Amino acid sequence: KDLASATNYVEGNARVTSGDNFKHVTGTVTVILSQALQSNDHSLLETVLNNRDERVIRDTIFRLKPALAVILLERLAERIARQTHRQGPLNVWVKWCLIIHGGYLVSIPNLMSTLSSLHSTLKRRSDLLPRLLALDARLDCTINKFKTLEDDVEYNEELDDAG
Amino acid sequence: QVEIANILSSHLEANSTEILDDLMSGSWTEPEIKKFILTKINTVDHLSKIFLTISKSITQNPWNEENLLPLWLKWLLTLKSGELNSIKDKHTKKNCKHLKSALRSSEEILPVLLGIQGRLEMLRRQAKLRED
Amino acid sequence: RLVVSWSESTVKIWTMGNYKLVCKLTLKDDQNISTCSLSPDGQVLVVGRPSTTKVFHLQPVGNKLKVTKLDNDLLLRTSTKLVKFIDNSKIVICSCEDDVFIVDLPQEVELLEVTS
Amino acid sequence: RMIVHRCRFVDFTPATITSLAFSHKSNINKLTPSDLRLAIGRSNGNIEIWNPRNNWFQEMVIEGGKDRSIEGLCWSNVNGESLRLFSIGGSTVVTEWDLAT
Amino acid sequence: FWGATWISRIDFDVDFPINGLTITDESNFMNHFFFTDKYKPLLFVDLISSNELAIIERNQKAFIQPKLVF
């Protein structure tokens, strides 16, 4: 390399991270839900998470054993983190857990360390909101404005001569 | 409707102070507001007067419960943005900045508030579950 | 209210009250059309080419024009740079050899000599 | 006040210019000859003769034919003879034109 | 009166107030008021009626030479 030349920037194999990274600081499927959480069976639980019926969500978590609820909250954060497009459905699960077992969650020595993933995860969605509203308003005005805003006659000489 | 539209048209020509009251008339409906701005606001001066009046009121009380004036502002800008910025009055620009300042604060208000709206929701729902 | 355009041996006629292409005419000859003249009434359309001159009668049927080719040998063997209508019947044709004559649908017209 | 019917349903498209040729050799010292003309070659067989005097006014058009084009143009200007125009139509043929007719 | 890109009208009962890329033309060639240029190009211009005017107007890939924009 020419000594006059300046060394270029290369990230290489460096590990990226964020400041929120607080790791080192009938019809119910409850029994399956309790089953998979205890045994960490991703396949079994994913089937349980596939239910989109709100009444099922409430009833299942209603009977879930309160200690198992905490680990469920942790796991939903991870599954949200990997796939953000599933944010909508999974907040419902986090919601119904929080209200029903809220009394239990109060009587816990520490929450932030064990629920850090949720807080970081939930925080990210909030940081989007101010910008999206700006996008919506600009996206609002434009649509708002724009919503308001031979053979039959042919004469062929050759065919006429022919007939 | 037609009478109020004519009255507002007359007051705009007459430079009457009653313009706010005409805009505050409850008879106004959203389709009518579109028709008035599109059809009757043909002069830059009338557009400036309405914008100055409405902006001043909202700036004074951005949290007024009545949605009529905000409706007037939102439709005024969407349909006459090109004519509005064409206005070269310094006072009109100054009134804009004041309206921005009050509304800018309101945006800062919202994110904490939305949490509080949620934070009460479970307290109500949790209370309902206890009742059951 | 007819607008007539001719390009590359194809004549298209439009009527405007809003416009409707009432008829279009396709001609055999490879030669492009030099000029087209329409009678004041519009019933008679003359299509002119250097090789030949052809006249076609236009008749309106059901918001459309029916075309019939009136047969006149003299025009067919006549070269035409320019052609115009005196009236609905009589025309003036200037042949490629500068011969001006009148045809009733030839009455030659005397022309002053030009000094070389 | 009169009604204007602005009509664009009529489409006339010219042919691509294919060749260009002047009828005289350039002579800076001498004055422009009265007979100078410019020949325009078209892809649809048309030869257009234009006059560079009085801005540019177009004098006479030679009409082309179906499936006929122009690929080359040359002028012959021999003293005492009429200007002669020769064209190539993309075939094994050289065509000399009667400028009179 | 009209050309390829202009249309004009003149009244012959009123007299007017007295108040580069072509040959210089040193040699001989041989040997009430309305003007508009709005309509162009013009194929043909003529009246339909006393108050109706006909104006007929004209309505291939290209080698890409980008125009730098910043």
């Binding site: 509203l133 700006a134 919506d136 308003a137 600009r138 609002d140 005005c141 | 909202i58 951005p62 949290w63 419960e65 949605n67 905000p70 502002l73 939102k74 800008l77 969407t78 943005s81 804009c96 309206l99 921005k100 509304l103 800018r104 309101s106 945006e107 208000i109 919202l110 508030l113 939305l114 709206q117 | 809003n18 416009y19 | 006040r1 009169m2 009604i3 204007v4 019917h5 602005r6 009509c7 664009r8 349903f9 | 009208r9 309305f34 508009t36 005017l53 309505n59």
Partner: peptide, 29 residues
């Protein structure tokens, strides 16, 4: 009620930040 007031305010704020073939026309002479 304060939610919709604030949300309404937001939309207003961001808002403030932001040939025919045949034509019939009458000439003037």
């Amino acid at each position: 009620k304060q939610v919709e007031i604030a949300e309404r305010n937001t939309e207003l704020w961001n808002l403030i930040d932001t040939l025919p073939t045949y034509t019939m026309e009458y000439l003037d002479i």
